[PDB]
Amino acid sequence: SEDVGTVVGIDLGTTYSCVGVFKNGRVEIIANDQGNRITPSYVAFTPEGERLIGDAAKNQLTSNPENTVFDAKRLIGRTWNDPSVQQDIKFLPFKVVEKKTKPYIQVDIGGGQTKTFAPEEISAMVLTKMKETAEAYLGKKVTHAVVTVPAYFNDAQRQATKDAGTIAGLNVMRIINEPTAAAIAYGLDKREGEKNILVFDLGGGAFDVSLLTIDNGVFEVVATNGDTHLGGEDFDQRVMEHFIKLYKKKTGKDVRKDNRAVQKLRREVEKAKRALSSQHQARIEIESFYEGEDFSETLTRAKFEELNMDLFRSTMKPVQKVLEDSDLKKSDIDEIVLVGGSTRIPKIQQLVKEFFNGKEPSRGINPDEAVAYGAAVQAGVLSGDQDTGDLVLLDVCPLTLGIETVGGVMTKLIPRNTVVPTKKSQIFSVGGTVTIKVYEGERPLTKDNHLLGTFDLTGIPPAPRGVPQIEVTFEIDVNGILRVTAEDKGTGNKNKITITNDQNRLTPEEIERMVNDAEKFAEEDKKLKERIDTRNELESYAYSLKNQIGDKEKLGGKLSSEDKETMEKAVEEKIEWLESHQDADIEDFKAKKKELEEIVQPIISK
Numbered sequence: 323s324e325d326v327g328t329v330v331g332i333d334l335g336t337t338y339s340c341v342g343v344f345k346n347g348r349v350e351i352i353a354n355d356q357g358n359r360i361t362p363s364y365v366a367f368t369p370e371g372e373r374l375i376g377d378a379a380k381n382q383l384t385s386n387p388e389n390t391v392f393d394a395k396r397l398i399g400r401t402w403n404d405p406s407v408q409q410d411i412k413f414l415p416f417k418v419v420e421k422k423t424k425p426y427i428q429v430d431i432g433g434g435q436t437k438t439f440a441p442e443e444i445s446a447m448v449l450t451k452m453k454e455t456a457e458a459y460l461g462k463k464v465t466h467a468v469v470t471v472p473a474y475f476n477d478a479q480r481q482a483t484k485d486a487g488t489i490a491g492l493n494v495m496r497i498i499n500e501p502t503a504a505a506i507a508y509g510l511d512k513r514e515g516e517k518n519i520l521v522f523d524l525g526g527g528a529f530d531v532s533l534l535t536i537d538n539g540v541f542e543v544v545a546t547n548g549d550t551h552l553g554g555e556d557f558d559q560r561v562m563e564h565f566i567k568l569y570k571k572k573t574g575k576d577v578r579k580d581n582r583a584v585q586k587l588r589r590e591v592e593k594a595k596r597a598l599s600s601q602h603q604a605r606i607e608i609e610s611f612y613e614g615e616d617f618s619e620t621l622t623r624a625k626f627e628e629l630n631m632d633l634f635r636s637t638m639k640p641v642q643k644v645l646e647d648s649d650l651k652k653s654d655i656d657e658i659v660l661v662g663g664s665t666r667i668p669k670i671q672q673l674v675k676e677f678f679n680g681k682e683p684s685r686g687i688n689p690d691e692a693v694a695y696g697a698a699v700q701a702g703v704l705s706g707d708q709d710t711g712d713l714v715l716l717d718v719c720p721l722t723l724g725i726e727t728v729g730g731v732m733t734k735l736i737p738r739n740t741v742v743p744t745k746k747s748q749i750f751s752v753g754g755t756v757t758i759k760v761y762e763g764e765r766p767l768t769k770d771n772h773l774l775g776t777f778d779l780t781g782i783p784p785a786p787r788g789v790p791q792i793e794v795t796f797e798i799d800v801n802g803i804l805r806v807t808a809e810d811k812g813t814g815n816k817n818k819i820t821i822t823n824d825q826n827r828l829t830p831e832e833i834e835r836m837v838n839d840a841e842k843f844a845e846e847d848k849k850l851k852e853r854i855d856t857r858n859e860l861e862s863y864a865y866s867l868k869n870q871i872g873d874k875e876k877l878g879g880k881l882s883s884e885d886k887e888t889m890e891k892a893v894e895e896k897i898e899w900l901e902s903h904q905d906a907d908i909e910d911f912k913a914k915k916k917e918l919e920e921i922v923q924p925i926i927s928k
């Protein structure tokens with residue numbers, strides 16, 4: 323088998339991402355080059371050609387909103403006609419365009435150049451940054467990763483996250499659902515017997531709920547449900563829609579058309595929201611908001627709640643379904659674990675306490691980091707030689723799979739909350755070329771569920787006395803992803819299997835371009851780095867020589883007025899040169915260094 327190296331655990335979140343590693347019997351959550359244990363899931367393209375990621379991209383959002391990309395997780399794995407995609411793009415500053423019926427991100431990379439990106443490639447960039455953050459901490463290179471996804475992500479969404487991993491040069495070994503991961507972080511070291519645990523994950527863009535059983539070191543997911551388009555960014559968006567309206571009331575101006583203004587508002591709103599988790603009031607002051615004029619308002623916690631109460635309450639609907647599916651009731655639940663930054667909002671904590679008749683949720687557990695914590699643990703296990711505690715994971719598929727039948731009937735195949743890996747065989751007697759439409763979801767009619775894909779069977783052998791019997795097998799792997807194979811029961815030895823997979827996915831050719839484009843950008847970013855670092859060598863060398871000459875105690879007492887004048891001039895010449903050619907290329911600097919060394923070298927060696 324493969325030497326998988328150190329395996330890293332990544333929480334690839336909507337607004338934030340987090341990387342951990344298991345080593346010396348301990349999880350370390352890894353800080354980035356700015357000393358932050360979490361990293362904004364942002365990428366930006368500066369007018370000067372530069373491609374920024376994380377905190378740096380985020381810090382230039384309001385000065386360059388149209389080419390700062392964010393919330394790409396809300397687009398990953400979706401189609402154009404998805405209602406969720408069409409609602410989202412109405413509040414995104416960067417262009418989003420259809421192609422191959424998928425939403426692609428279109429931006430300006432600088433110098434009049436337009437690039438269109440698949441959300442997978444934007445997520446790849448975020449993951450690459452997380453890879454590098456780890457590689458630095460370890461002092462070595464990394465190739466395998468465990469990556470989280472929300473429990474309720476469907477098949478496309480899982481696959482796309484995996485592809486994203488690939489494009490960033492990572493083998494995604496295991497996709498792990500976020501509440502499961504958090505559960506490990508909660509209940510790894512627990513030795514209290516079988517206890518029912520409810521994990522309530524509310525982050526930046528997605529909502530997951532799972533009921534687990536945790537007996538000692540054995541984790542079993544009983545039931546799962548959530549909303550993949552519901553989170554912090556939606557609370558922010560309600561508070562923005564409000565202040566825009568308010569500002570038009572009070573000033574007559576509609577600021578919706580100016581992305582700078584909106585984005586400045588988003589930034590400060592978010593900051594207000596956070597404050598309102600520990601205060602009752604927050605001033606939102608934005609200087610030079612619109613046209614030239616300043617903005618100034620107060621958001622009370624009460625108002626933040628009126629605006630968002632429908633959304634807060636809708637988190638209880640999946641929590642019910644979870645219990646209903648678990649055949650358990652509220653009093654059975656031993657602990658309710660909260661993860662995701664959005665669970666810091668008091669009203670969410672309150673609605674949860676009330677739903678469980680006054681039961682107090684669990685503290686102790688960092689809601690921003692827990693999900694990566696658990697991923698890191700699961701990475702340790704996969705890294706081979708690590709001393710994690712006992713860990714057993716049984717996790718489930720979240721959505722019933724079925725096929726369309728006469729009428730448009732969702733003829734069920736694999737129920738939801740089935741443990742994975744699982745498979746289901748199915749004999750068909752249709753010959754010729756049969757088309758199978760698979761579907762995802764709990765509704766008894768096909769129209770009302772999500773189309774996963776269309777699988778054509780072209781292989782079937784032709785009979786002498788008629789009709790072939792084909793066994794179609796639907797396997798769901800440990801990651802949650804469907805694979806579909808076939809075999810006929812008419813031939814000994816020959817089994818004739820042909821699956822054309824008419825399905826909205828990046829091809830292996832498309833993935834190859836995007837991987838090579840990523841490798842190009844790395845090389846490009848590497849050379850921009852060599853151009854900076856060698857301009858600095860020159861500039862330092864020059865300044866250093868200028869000290870040594872003016873220093874009568876060391877290298878300037880040794881010089882004659884002839885050689886002193888020639889040194890002063892050679893250095894003074896190259897400095898006011900460097901000051902006016904900042905845009906010079908790598909070879910210009912290499913030359914000027916060597917022009918200056920030519921002259922200095924004979925002189926200093928006397």
Ligand SMILES: Nc1ncnc2c1ncn2[C@@H]1O[C@H](COP(=O)(O)OP(=O)(O)OP(=O)(O)O)[C@@H](O)[C@H]1O
Nearest residue numbers: 335336337338525526527528554599662663664666
């Ligand atoms: N004190 C607070 N009060 C309210 N919201 C907060 C607070 N602290 C953080 N948040 C919110 O938490 C959200 C991010 O949490 P988190 O990082 O867990 O999600 P994520 O991993 O980015 O994405 P996903 O939803 O996909 O897991 C942000 O919207 C932020 O506004």
Ligand SMILES: [Mg+2]
Nearest residue numbers: 906907909910
């Ligand atoms: Mg030149």
Ligand SMILES: [Zn+2]
Nearest residue numbers: 333335525693
């Ligand atoms: Zn997260």
Ligand SMILES: [Zn+2]
Nearest residue numbers: 515516537538
């Ligand atoms: Zn037991």
